[PDB]
RNA sequence: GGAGCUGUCAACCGAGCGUGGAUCCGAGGAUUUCCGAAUGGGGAAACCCAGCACGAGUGAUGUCGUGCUACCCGCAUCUGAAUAUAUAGGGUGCGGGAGGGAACGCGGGGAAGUGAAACAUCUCAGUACCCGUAGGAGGAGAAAACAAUUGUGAUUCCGCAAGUAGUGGCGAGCGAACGCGGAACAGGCUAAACCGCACGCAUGGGUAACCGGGUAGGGGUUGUGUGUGCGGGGUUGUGGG
RNA sequence: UAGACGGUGAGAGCCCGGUACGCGAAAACCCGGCACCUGCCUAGUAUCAAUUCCCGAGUAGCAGCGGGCCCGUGGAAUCCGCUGUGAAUCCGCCGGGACCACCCGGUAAGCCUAAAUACUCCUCGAUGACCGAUAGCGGAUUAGUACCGUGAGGGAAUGGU
RNA sequence: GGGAUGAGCUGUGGGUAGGGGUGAAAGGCCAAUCAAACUCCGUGAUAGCUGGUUCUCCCCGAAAUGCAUUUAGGUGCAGC
RNA sequence: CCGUACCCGUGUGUGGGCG
RNA sequence: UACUAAAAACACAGGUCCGUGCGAAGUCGCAAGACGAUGUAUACGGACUGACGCCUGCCCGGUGCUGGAAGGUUAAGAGG
RNA sequence: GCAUCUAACCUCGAACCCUGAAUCGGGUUUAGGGACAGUGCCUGGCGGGUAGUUUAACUGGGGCGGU
C-alpha cells in the first residue's frame, strides 16, 4: 500500500507527497500517529 | 379470587386422643399441609370467633399399603392441635 | 487462539501423512495474532486475536 | 344426542342426578398446586428463603392473596470511569433466546472390531458415535455448466449408462462421468458508471462560479472535490448502462 | 346402490351395531372469492458513433501442506481448507484432465427460490397365503412395572368358568 | 498373636476416573470383577477352533494321496 | 400438662429523666 | 499382595548425584490456569543408596549426559 | 550480520478506574523487555513418552541345533 504523508517524516518525505513503506512501519507508526493516510481518494484533493 | 380460612381448615380429627383433648378444650383439625401455625391461628380465630392460645402442628406421613397391583401410599396429612384461651368459649363442632 | 474475531476463520482439519502414508489427524490453524485495535484515532485499545489476512487488509487499526 | 347416568381394575354398597335434556360426543374458553429450560435467591427436582408493589388481616408485629424481580442477545434512549475527546461500564424501556421431540436434513469432528487368511497403505467407513444447527421437509438451484464442429441449456430425485472407464500393497477391494429415458419444472433480487437530497471534511472571493436548458438582466461567496447515509438506475454473456 | 365387518346362547344380507347410499356444523381451524388495503407504471422510444467510465479482493492465480473426487500425488485437471505471495474489470477473467497455440463455452469471489425427493413420535381409514400368550412389542397381565445394580444401566413372569 | 500418643485409629463432608486415578510399590486398589473397571452402543465383532444342524425311502458311493502354501489339524488344483 | 424459667420481637399505658 | 505370600520386599531417618535463578525445574491441562509455593538454592523436583561405624578402589573404550564449534554432512526457504 | 531505537508484540513489575464487596478480567498510565520471544504455516532432528502391529514353518511334543 501507498501512504500520502500529511506530516513531515525525516528521510521519508515532506507534506503531501506519496511514499511507499514496508507495511509494518505504516500501520504501526504512521497511521496511528496521524503522520500518513492511505492513498485512495486524496490525490484529487491534493491536485 | 378472595381466599378464606375455611379452606385452610379441612376437617376435625375424630379419634380417642381427639376426644381426650376435647375434654380439656383442645381441638385437632386436619389442615392443608402447606399451612403454618400463624395462619391456623388466624383462621380458627375468625372461623369460630374464639381466642386461640396456641396451635401445635404435626406432619403425618401417609400409610403405605400393599394391594394386588403394588404398594400405594395414602395421603400425607397435617394435624393442627389448637388450644384456646383459658376461659374462651368452646367451639360447637356438632358431634 | 485459532479463531479470528473479524472473519471468523477457524482451523481446518486434515491429515499429517507419513512416508509410509500413515495419516493421522491434525489441524491447520489460521495465523492468528493479537492486535490492540482502536475504533477511532486515539481511542481506547481493545485486545483482539485476528488473522494475518485481516491484518494485511485494513480490517483492524492500531 | 335423546334416556339413562354417577370412568375403570371391581363386586359390594351408600348417596343422588336426569326429557325443565343428565350421562355421553365435538369445539372454544376458565381454572391450572409444586417441580422441571425453570428464570427472585437457594436447593438433595417436586423443597427452603425472600425483595418490591398492590390488596386482605391484627391492637401491632406475626400471617394471607395477586403480580413483578434470572442471565444473555438485539434495538432504542439517559449517563460517560481512569481521562479530555471519548469508550468500557452503568440506568431505563421494549422485543427475542434458552428447553424438549421417533425418524428424515445440512455443516463440522470422527473410531474400532472387521476384510486384506498376518499387517501398517488400503478396508471397514466418512459407518458408529459426537458437536453445531434446522425445516416441514431440508440441502441443491439459475452456468466462471456441459459438450465437441449441427449441440444441450437452473436444481433435485428415479432408471440406465455400469460393476463399465478407471482406480487399488493393481492386493482385499473401491468405482465414476458423458449421455439417454422419466418425475417435476421457474426464475429472481443485490454495487458501480451515473444522477439528485441531507450530513461531515478541504478550498476562494470577483478566483470564479452558482441560481433547470436557451434568450436578457438581476443576486453578487455558497460553488467545487470528496467520505458517509437516502433514494433512483442497472443486474447481463449475441456481453451487460 | 346394503352378501363389508362385528355382535347376538352354534356358519345371520333380512335380530342388533352397522354396511351401500344419502344428509349433517353454533363455533373453531383450514380452504377459496369478493371487497377494503398495499405496492408498481403513467414517460420514454428509436437510431447514430464508439472518445471516455462500470461489472462485487486479501478474492482469483501461483507456491507449500492437506482434504475430496474413479484418481491411494501421479504429468494432476476441476473442487475445498490453512500458510505465504498476491492480481486484473472485458483489448478482463475462468473452464474445456500437465502445458502451449488456436478454437469453443461461461461470466467466480453477494443473496433468495416452488415442484418432483426423505421421514412418521402422532391422527384417521383400511389391509395382511403376518403372530396368536415360550409367539407377536420387553410389555394382551402392576410393564419399562416387580426385581437387580451405588450408578449409567439391565429387566421379567403372569390371558381363557 | 502385632500395634495400641502415633508414619495411630475413626466419624462426617469433600477431591482425584479408565491408558486415567491412586499406590510406604503387592501390578496392589479404583463398588464381592483389574497386566487397563463398569454400562450402553459399533454388534448378530471376529474365531483356519469346539459344539450343534430336526421326516422317509430308492440308486451310486469315496478320501485320508500328489503338488503348492506365513503351510503342516486350514486351503487351492489334481487324484478318488 | 403442672411448677418455675430464659430469649427475640410487637403494641398499649404510667412514672420520671435526656434532647 | 481386601480374598493362599507380612517377608529378607516397600518406606524410613541419613548419604550422594543430577536438575531448578523463579507465574523455576517438574507435573496436570490443547490453552488459560493450577500445583510446586503464598516456597526462592540451608529451597523445590528427579534418581540411586538406605540408621550408625570403617570405608567406597581401577576403567570415559561402548551407551548416555554436559560443554565446544574448526571442519564434513543436510531439510524447508531462497536461487534459477 | 552487528549495534542502537520504539511503535508492533510481550510483562504474574507498579499505580489508577470499571469496583459497591475483587490476589479474576479488562481498560488507562507508567516501568521494563523488544522486533527478540510467543504463535501460524513450512521444515530437519529427536522421540518406547504413546500407539498400532510384526516377530515363519518343518520338527518322532515344543525350544535349542539343523533345514
Ligand atoms: Mg508484510
Ligand atoms: Mg406449646
Ligand atoms: Mg413440630
Ligand atoms: Mg399391613
Ligand atoms: Mg474465541
Ligand atoms: Mg476431513
Ligand atoms: Mg485407519
Ligand atoms: Mg490466504
Ligand atoms: Mg362435554
Ligand atoms: Mg377445553
Ligand atoms: Mg427457582
Ligand atoms: Mg435454581
Ligand atoms: Mg471522558
Ligand atoms: Mg432448539
Ligand atoms: Mg484397522
Ligand atoms: Mg486381517
Ligand atoms: Mg482371520
Ligand atoms: Mg431451501
Ligand atoms: Mg435428463
Ligand atoms: Mg446505494
Ligand atoms: Mg359376517
Ligand atoms: Mg493451493
Ligand atoms: Mg486429492
Ligand atoms: Mg462477477
Ligand atoms: Mg450471481
Ligand atoms: Mg437457496
Ligand atoms: Mg423441494
Ligand atoms: Mg403418510
Ligand atoms: Mg391405525
Ligand atoms: Mg411375550
Ligand atoms: Mg435401588
Ligand atoms: Mg492384644
Ligand atoms: Mg509382644
Ligand atoms: Mg502393646
Ligand atoms: Mg511381579
Ligand atoms: Mg474389588
Ligand atoms: Mg486394552
Ligand atoms: Mg460393523
Ligand atoms: Mg454299492
Ligand atoms: Mg478339492
Ligand atoms: Mg409453663
Ligand atoms: Mg493375601
Ligand atoms: Mg497372610
Ligand atoms: Mg532422603
Ligand atoms: Mg544441587
Ligand atoms: Mg514450566
Ligand atoms: Mg544417578
Ligand atoms: Mg535398597
Ligand atoms: Mg564405585
Ligand atoms: Mg569420551
Ligand atoms: Mg516460527
Ligand atoms: Mg508398544
Ligand atoms: Mg487391528
Ligand atoms: Mg512349529
Ligand atoms: Mg525335537
Ligand atoms: Zn480474519
Curated annotation (Swiss-Prot), chain A:
UniProt-recorded name of the protein: Large ribosomal subunit protein bL9
Role, per record: Binds to the 23S rRNA.
Stated family: Belongs to the bacterial ribosomal protein bL9 family.
Tree of life domain: Bacteria
Protein source organism: Mycobacterium bovis (strain BCG / Pasteur 1173P2)
Region of the whole protein represented: 1 to 47 of 152
UniProtKB/Swiss-Prot annotation, chain B:
Record flagged with keyword Ribonucleoprotein: yes
Protein name in the entry: Large ribosomal subunit protein uL23
Family named by the database record: Belongs to the universal ribosomal protein uL23 family.
Gene Ontology biological-process entries: translation
One Pfam assignment: Ribosomal_L23
Assembly description: Part of the 50S ribosomal subunit. Contacts protein L29, and trigger factor when it is bound to the ribosome.
PANTHER family for this protein: 60S RIBOSOMAL PROTEIN L23A (PTHR11620)
GO cellular component: ribonucleoprotein complex; ribosome
Record's keyword terms, sorted: Ribonucleoprotein, Ribosomal protein, RNA-binding, rRNA-binding
Record HAMAP family: Ribosomal_uL23_B
One function term, GO molecular function aspect: rRNA binding
Its job: One of the early assembly proteins it binds 23S rRNA. One of the proteins that surrounds the polypeptide exit tunnel on the outside of the ribosome. Forms the main docking site for trigger factor binding to the ribosome.
